[PDB]
Amino acid sequence: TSAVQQKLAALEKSSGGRLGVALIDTADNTQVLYRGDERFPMCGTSKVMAAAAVLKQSETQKQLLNQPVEIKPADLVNYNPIAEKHVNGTMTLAELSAAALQYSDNTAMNKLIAQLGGPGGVTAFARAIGDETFRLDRTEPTLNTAIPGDPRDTTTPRAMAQTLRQLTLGHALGETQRAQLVTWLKGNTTGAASIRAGLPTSWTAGDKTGSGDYGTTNDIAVIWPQGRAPLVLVTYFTQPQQNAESRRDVLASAARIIAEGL
């Protein structure tokens, strides 16, 4: 138990919920874990794996990202800020990837999942890049039920941090695809209250948030601290009551503890 792990435990104790953290510091490859091997519901953070899998497919199909996908009225689900504008029209796979990542559009995520052959296709890509933990079992919006003890649509902080590192800083994707993914993450619109609220302003980052039932509040990020090699940070948080409120502040607090511990 490290000093940082002790502060994370204190934060968790005061939060009432269950906190999972995984940091990889690429300056030396060291890691900091808190419940790093416990499973948590991914919710929207799973959108990174789906977009990355489509990017992988695009490496052998130069026109894939320009394929027009039909958006029908019935395709709309619970949260579709971008897709709703294109009902009875089409969106390209690039448009669907950007909407899923940067706006957390659920209809867009469902189109990425369908392009991959269903939730199992997203899981297959994860296995192909060495992630033996990740599992996607359902489409949107049910993949966000986040029921405690339910293994569906979960991963561990350790696994997600390693995967995010390989996707954004490593060679799991071709260079062009890696750059596209990083560009999309850096352009996220939903993350200012989460991990990034706990980092010094000078630091830059890309992230993908997630939210679900049980007050599930998640964020995964790739960070470029001022004058330091990048970090990869995963912060997952879930609560005992189905109707619990979101706690993005708890993710900010975890990130702050990690940053001050550097």
Ligand X SMILES: CC1(C)S[C@@H]2[C@H](NC(=O)Cc3ccccc3)C(=O)N2[C@H]1C(=O)O
102 binds ligand X (CB under 6 A): no
Give the binding range for ligand X (CB under 6 A) out of 163-171, 179-187, 197-205, 252-260. Answer: 163-171
CA-based nearest residue to 156, from 131, 185, 178, 191: 131
Tell me whether residue 8 or residue 212 sits nearer to ligand X (CB atom): 212
Smallest distance, Å, CB 52 to ligand X? Answer: 11
Tell me whether residue 12 or residue 105 sits nearer to ligand X (CB atom): 105
Helix (H) / strand (E) element for 250: namely helix 248-260
Distance CA 209, CA 20 (A): 14
DSSP for residue 47? H
- C-alpha distances (whole Å) from 7 to each of 3, 10, 94, 129, 164 are 6, 5, 41, 33, 24
Neighbours of 191 (CB within 10 A): 21
- C-alpha distances (whole Å) from 171 to each of 34, 130, 178 are 27, 12, 8
Give the binding range for ligand X (CB under 6 A) out of 10-18, 167-175, 195-203, 251-259. Answer: 167-175
Residue type, 140: E
Task: Please list every residue from 168 through 197 that binds ligand X, using CB under 6 A.
Answer: 169-172, 190
Maximum distance among all alpha carbons in the chain?
Answer: 55
Tell me whether residue 21 or residue 99 sits nearer to ligand X (CB atom): 99
Binding pattern for the stretch 54-83 against ligand X, x by CB under 6 A and - elsewhere:
-------------xxxx-------xx----
Q: In the structure encoding, which two tokens stand for residue 154, read together?
A: 């979960």
Distance CA 49, CA 65 (A): 16
110 binds ligand X (CB under 6 A): no
Q: From the list 58, 97, 106, 107, which residue makes contact with ligand X (rule: CB under 6 A)? A: 106
Task: Please list every residue from 196 through 235 that binds ligand X, using CB under 6 A.
Answer: 209-213, 229-230
Tell me whether residue 97 or residue 209 sits nearer to ligand X (CB atom): 209
Binding pattern for the stretch 15-44 against ligand X, x by CB under 6 A and - elsewhere:
-----------x----------------xx
Interacting residues toward ligand X by CB under 6 A: 26, 43-44, 67-70, 78-79, 104, 106, 141, 144, 165-166, 169-172, 190, 209-213, 229-230
